[PDB]
């Protein structure tokens, strides 16, 4: 995007001042859309010495004589050329700038326009800057952030010591990663993405995307009327144990609710009977185990079962002991079908096995599972999209790193999911998603497409729950998936 | 406004390119507001070699990659610097320009953006330009005009041989006189006035205004609860004759419907009885005349009647013969009260009398009456605001020159009224307005304020008629005035 601005100026020949004017007017129009008529509000515009601040001067200037009051507090020690030109215009148009910030200044204003730092933020915020930001955050005023709330690192979404909490963030060209990942996503408040005049070809050149409704709608497979169950694929799910009897059910129904033709579970007896007592449209094959867990003794029967399906999901509720590890790894090494690898199958996975497989894979870890898979801490892997990209590329797989924002990548393309709510922070949610992914692969979508469509619909189904989200359970999520699908169209 | 652009560039220091960018984006946003989503439309943008065309290139460029198709036909022989910069940007962004216009080109487009000439139009349009404009006008496509429809003189509203007929005109800063006066007002279609970044102080520096709802609302006099009829003034109307018995009635009710406390008519007997048979709240004084018309024999009685009122309206239906002329002129020469002078009182008026009067006057001619008053042709006075200004200034009066757009001026300030419809093109309409003006003067408004408020409310009342406007009559207009007043608040 820094490249995108540079290229639009230096190669397309758009004057930097024109981009800055377009930026500032976007902010004004966005504020109108969100606040109604602006003429009765008093505005405090906080400007840094960079181009974020220059954008702020354009805002301040365009409000002069139209709103009740405008004041700029200029907080920098020097001005870039664009900021300087705009500062000059603001003053020439009669605008008041002060350079001293006063704790009680927030008193006489209704809206704070935060133009202190955008993408040029480098390093922790301290000193006056920190104080001012902490004052704004205690004030209860309406806060509108220019580009990115000041103090959010726009590449990571991390808070650099402190950051503005915005009601509205107006960003230019494309969303920044720091609007998408938390905590930045939380501080952004409502996000509007403004077109400021970059050529559309450059804007579409970005390789990381937010999964949208329109993208998911164009990926949903077709339902030709002259069809039969095999048209819509066959999934095998290897799952469950005597400790964990519920997981297979949630995964199997997850495949069926997204439109899969046939779903077969392989589950240790008698825990297999649990699935059809709840959902008799599932096939739940009893697997004879020594102690209630899959082991090498079950390898041959599972590979046999695999021959007559399109995709295999493995992992939810398998448990994690040595015999499960031996079985999961030998199985995956031999299985020549796409695999969806989750939960305890990830906990025992030997990643060499992924490298040697000819057929594809999707892995669906939460950060604790990712952390153990790559031998790092939760904090190093959480929201770490570059690590996820390297992992997917090195191991030839699609990685779905689950969290309130989910990252989906094959190492070349990375997509970010923002649907969902905290009702999904509850046992059983993951199991459902695993079924959904396998189901969509069986219907003909690529592992990456299948993952994209499933994370979005899974979170969107959660949002459609009628009562308080904290009461949502996996069973109710399943009931909601077909409404999510209908609403997507 | 040319001064306004120059001053914003040369003294405030806004780069001309920034004004041009703001102009072009206004047009795009206005088109969205009016057409909805633009992404399915095909646009033909016609650009002249001036800054109007430069605005057009900004439009074309901002549509690239967002709509179905964009084509510019460049029709000039050379380009101003701003147009050239924008033309260069449009091409650099991948835009197609052709310089040959082809009669069938309109075929493959849905919207024509007319950026051929704006305020720089000089002289009749001929040649290719004329052909292209005539083609656009026969095409049935959606036409959006940049600044002013090409071929309208923006200072007068006249068509310079031919002009574009627009569905939507997007103008910058302030309405131009050529959007306000006909025929230009008709060719403008729907007008949006866009703020492109001129300092608000310069925009408010324009001396000619369009009468708005908000202006009229702020001028309506107060109705203090502890009031009595004298609080709201007293009007005398000298009007009527044996030929013209209806006019006094319409004028008198016009004063009462705008809230005047007392209204007295002086009308030749027995034609005076006509007024109270219809509206018994009117006082209609019988004047004894020799032959059914006012003459010098009635001077003394009229001046007596004048002593106990605040304002006098004179003229509607008096007739026009020598004795009326002698009476009207001697009366006005002696009357030391504000006068509202209409109809036959204008037809007989000696304008020297206006110069010698100490008290104020409003004159309310239609163009035929103005033409005879200044000894010019109808065509020379019609919509001739500069002539109206000179007349008002020379004779110390307010001039209300009635037409579909009405001009109201005291020689310093000129206001244009755009309310009304063709139902007012019917006998009796003028008589009503005369009463309204006198009424508002009696309530405490200046002659100019009274005229401003009355022309607006008179036309607005017409618009509120429930059935087809051609069936509107003066009597029904009167019934509508109090609803117009309520809707203004």
């Amino acid at each position: 995007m820094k490249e995108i601005d540079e290229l639009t100026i230096k190669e397309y020949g758009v004057d930097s001042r024109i981009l800055m004017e377009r930026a500032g007017i976007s902010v004004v129009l966005a504020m109108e859309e969100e606040l109604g008529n602006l003429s009765d509000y008093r505005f405090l515009v906080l400007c840094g010495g960079g181009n974020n601040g220059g954008d702020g001067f354009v805002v301040a200037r365009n409000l002069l004589g139209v709103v009740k009051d405008v004041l700029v507090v200029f907080l920098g020690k020097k001005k870039t050329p664009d900021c300087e030109y705009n500062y000059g215009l603001y003053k020439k148009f009669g605008g008041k700038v002060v350079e001293q910030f006063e704790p009680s200044i927030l008193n006489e204003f209704d809206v704070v326009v935060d133009a202190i730092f955008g993408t040029g933020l480098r390093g922790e915020i301290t000193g006056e800057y920190a104080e001012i930001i902490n004052l704004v955050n205690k004030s209860g005023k309406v806060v509108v952030s220019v580009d990115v709330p000041s103090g959010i690192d726009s590449n990571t979404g991390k808070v650099l010591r402190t950051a503005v909490k915005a009601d509205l963030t107006v960003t230019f060209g494309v969303p920044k990663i720091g609007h998408i990942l938390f905590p930045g996503r939380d501080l952004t408040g409502k996000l509007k993405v403004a077109n400021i005049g970059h050529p559309v070809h450059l804007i579409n050149s970005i390789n990381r995307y937010v999964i949208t409704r329109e993208m998911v709608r164009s990926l949903l497979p077709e339902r030709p009327r002259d069809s039969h169950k095999g048209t819509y694929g066959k999934v095998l799910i290897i799952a469950g144990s005597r400790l964990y009897s519920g997981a297979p059910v949630l995964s199997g129904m997850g495949s069926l609710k997204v439109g899969t033709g046939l779903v077969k579970l392989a589950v240790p007896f008698p825990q297999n009977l649990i699935a059809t007592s709840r959902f008799p449209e599932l096939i739940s094959v009893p697997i004879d185990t020594e102690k209630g867990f899959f082991s090498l003794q079950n390898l041959q029967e599972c590979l046999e079962l695999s021959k007559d399906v399109d995709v295999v999901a493995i992992g939810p509720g398998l448990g994690n002991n040595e015999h499960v590890r031996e079985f999961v790894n030998e199985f995956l090494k031999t299985l020549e079908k796409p695999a969806v690898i989750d939960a305890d199958a990830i906990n025992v996975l030997d990643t060499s096995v992924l490298k040697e497989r000819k057929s594809p894979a999707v892995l669906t870890p939460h950060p604790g599972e990712m952390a153990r898979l790559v031998k790092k801490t939760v904090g190093d892997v959480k929201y770490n999209y570059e690590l996820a990209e390297e992992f997917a590329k090195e191991n030839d797989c699609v990685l779905v790193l689950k969290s309130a924002t989910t990252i989906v990548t094959d190492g070349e393309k990375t997509l970010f999911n923002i649907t969902g709510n905290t009702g999904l922070s509850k046992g059983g949610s993951g199991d459902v998603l695993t079924g959904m992914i396998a189901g969509f692969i069986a219907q003909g979508l690529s592992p990456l497409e299948a993952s994209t469509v499933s994370v979005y619909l899974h979170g969107f189904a959660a949002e459609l729950f009628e009562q308080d989200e904290r009461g949502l359970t996996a069973s109710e999520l399943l009931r909601l998936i077909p409404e999510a699908i209908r609403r997507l169209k | 406004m040319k001064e306004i652009d120059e001053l914003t560039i040369k003294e405030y220091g806004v780069d001309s390119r920034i004004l041009m960018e703001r102009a072009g984006i206004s047009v795009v946003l206005a088109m969205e507001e009016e057409l909805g989503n633009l992404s399915d439309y095909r646009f033909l943008v016609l650009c002249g070699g001036g800054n109007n065309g430069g605005d057009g290139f900004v439009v074309a460029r901002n549509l690239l990659g967002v709509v179905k198709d964009v084509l510019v036909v460049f029709l000039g022989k050379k380009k101003t610097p701003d147009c050239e910069y924008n033309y260069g940007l449009y091409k650099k962004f991948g835009g197609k320009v052709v310089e040959q216009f082809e009669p069938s080109i309109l075929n493959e487009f849905d919207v024509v953006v007319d950026a051929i000439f704006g305020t720089g139009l000089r002289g009749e349009i001929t040649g290719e330009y004329a052909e292209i404009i005539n083609l656009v006008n026969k095409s049935g496509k959606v036409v959006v005009s940049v600044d002013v429809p090409s071929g309208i003189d923006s200072n007068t509203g006249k068509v310079l041989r031919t002009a574009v007929k627009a569905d939507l005109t997007v103008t910058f800063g302030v309405p131009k006189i050529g959007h306000i006066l006909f025929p230009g007002r008709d060719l403008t279609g729907k007008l949006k006035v866009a703020n492109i970044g001129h300092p608000v102080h310069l925009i408010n520096s324009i001396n000619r205004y369009v009468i708005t709802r908000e202006m009229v609302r702020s001028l309506l006099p107060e109705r203090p609860r502890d009031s009595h009829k004298g609080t709201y003034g007293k009007v005398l109307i000298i009007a009527g004759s044996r030929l013209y018995s209806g006019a006094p009635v319409l004028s008198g009710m016009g004063s009462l419907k705008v809230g005047t406390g007392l209204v007295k008519l002086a009308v030749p007997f027995p034609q005076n009885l006509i007024a109270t048979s219809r509206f018994p709240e009117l006082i209609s004084v019988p004047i004894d005349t020799e032959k059914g018309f006012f003459s010098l024999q009635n001077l003394q009685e009229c001046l007596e009647l004048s002593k106990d009122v605040d304002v006098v309206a004179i003229g509607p239906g008096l007739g026009n013969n020598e004795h009326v002329r002698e009476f009207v002129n001697e009366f006005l020469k002696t009357l030391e009260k504000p006068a509202v002078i209409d109809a036959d009182a204008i037809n007989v008026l000696d304008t020297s009398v206006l110069k010698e009067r100490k008290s104020p006057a409003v004159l309310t001619p239609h163009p035929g009456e103005m033409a005879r008053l200044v000894k010019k042709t109808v065509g020379d006075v019609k919509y001739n605001y500069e002539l109206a200004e000179e007349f008002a200034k020379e004779n110390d009066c307010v001039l209300v020159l009635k037409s579909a757009t009405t001009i109201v001026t005291d020689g310093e300030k000129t206001l244009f009224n755009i309310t009304g419809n063709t139902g007012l093109s019917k006998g009796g309409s003028g008589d009503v307005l005369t009463g309204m003006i006198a009424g508002f003067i009696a309530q405490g408004l200046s002659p100019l304020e009274a005229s401003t408020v009355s022309v607006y409310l008179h036309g607005f009342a017409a618009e509120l008629f429930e059935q087809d406007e051609r069936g509107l009559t003066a009597s029904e207009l009167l019934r509508l005035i109090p609803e117009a007043i309520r809707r203004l608040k």
């Binding site: 129009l29 109108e32 139209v66 | 206004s26 206005a30 006035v193 703020n195």
Partner: peptide
């Protein structure tokens, strides 16, 4: 809202 457009 009439920052941009007056009717």
């Amino acid at each position: 809202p009439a920052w941009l457009f007056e009717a």
